[PDB]
Symmetry: C2
Subunit: 102 residues, 2 copies
Amino acid sequence: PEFSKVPKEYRTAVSKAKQYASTVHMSKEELRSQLVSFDKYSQDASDYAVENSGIDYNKQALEKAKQYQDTLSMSPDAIRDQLVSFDKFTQEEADYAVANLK
Amino acid sequence: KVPKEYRTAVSKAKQYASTVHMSKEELRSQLVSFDKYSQDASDYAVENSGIDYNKQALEKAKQYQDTLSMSPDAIRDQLVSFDKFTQEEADYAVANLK
């Protein structure tokens, strides 16, 4: 749905989604839950924001993967499972993240 | 009295405490592996940046609760087992969840 025909709330949710993605490295599902649970956006505004904020979730997975590697010295395989099972990144996002680790 | 690099490590440590919310042990490792500080500069920074690790545990507890819809008890275990916060930091964090 085009940006100009969308409620103000959806545009504010997009602004908030961009803030979260630039600071905390969330998967689409983590961000979807954050916008509803913390910011109190409706499910529809959150669902719109996670898809329409220009977020590259492969890059989000890579940044989270680097954090796990640097803060905890977790193995690439342990990081891949954590990103999928726990953070709820897709398998392809987690595979891309770990292929770009040290 | 302290080297410039110890003071920039403190300034870097404060940046993580305002946006990322790492435990002392996660931050100690981060400053070395990611930021390329010496182990001595990192060990100094994690203790001398005025960081409240109780507050860091609470901020990280809120992230788990809202991003993953985690229960208070699952968050408590996660903060200790995964994040390496102390038990006292994790107990404070969970007691302060709404």
